[PDB]
């Protein structure tokens, strides 16, 4: 049983990942510019719930993901979903220093995040990640490699050789992208490390974020609750 993803070239990998990108969705067109805690969480939840449907279809088009059993696919999406939403949000917000572009019609800052208890902290972390992506001049081709890595990496040890062969392929792709952009060998591996270190912070924001989300519901459609309950089972 051999996987098609391992035979892809780097350009073939990049183009397949770009082509699979989900669409940028909108939130409700009546966001009363002064928000309350309830309408803040309403807009965010509804938006995240619609994004999940596109995420599941994007995941099926990440090369090598369909080679895994249904169980392994479910596991990875359950572990990774808020990391994927977050790196997506942070990517969109790169051109908006100081703001979070949840949707083209929903661009927020620090003190709008104060409307929900504890969201201030995670907002500040998301803004630091975005600004870090901005200073790094993260490119779209790198961003899609990073987002695939999060999908395959974030549940791989909670289970595996196929996944790791695929991860290696994405690494080859990321270095291929850096060589083409003219970076030296040292700049290539230094940048690779910098990008993968940021993923640890994304893991951390997701963990902090998750624990608020499954305490909010404790104190959301059925798909979002099953995705949420997949983390609460260990709390």
């Amino acid at each position: 049983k051999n996987s098609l993803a391992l035979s892809l070239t780097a350009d073939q990998m990049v183009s397949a990942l770009l082509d699979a990108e989900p669409p940028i969705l909108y939130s409700e067109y009546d966001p009363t510019r002064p928000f309350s805690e309830a309408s803040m969480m309403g807009l965010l939840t509804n938006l995240a719930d619609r994004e999940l449907v596109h995420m599941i279809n994007w995941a099926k088009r990440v090369p090598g993901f369909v080679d895994l059993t249904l169980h392994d696919q479910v596991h990875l999406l359950e572990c990774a979903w808020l990391e994927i939403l977050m790196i997506g949000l942070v990517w969109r917000s790169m051109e908006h220093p100081g703001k979070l572009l949840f949707a083209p019609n929903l661009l927020l800052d620090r003190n709008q995040g104060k409307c929900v208890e504890g969201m201030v902290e995670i907002f500040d972390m998301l803004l630091a990640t975005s600004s870090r992506f901005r200073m790094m001049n993260l490119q779209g081709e790198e961003f899609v490699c990073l987002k695939s890595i999060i999908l395959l990496n974030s549940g791989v040890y909670t289970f595996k050789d196929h996944i790791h062969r695929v991860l290696d392929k994405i690494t080859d792709t990321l270095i291929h992208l850096m060589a083409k952009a003219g970076l030296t060998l040292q700049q290539q591996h230094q940048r690779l490390a910098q990008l993968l270190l940021i993923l640890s912070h994304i893991r951390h924001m997701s963990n902090k974020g998750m624990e608020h989300l499954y305490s909010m519901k404790c104190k959301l459609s059925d798909l979002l609750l099953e995705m949420l309950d997949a983390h609460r089972l260990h709390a």
């Binding site: 599941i56 099926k60 479910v74 995705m227």
Partner: peptide, 9 residues
């Protein structure tokens, strides 16, 4: 589980 359905459609 809903996620099962959505990964087959």
């Amino acid at each position: 589980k809903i996620l099962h359905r959505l990964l087959q459609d």
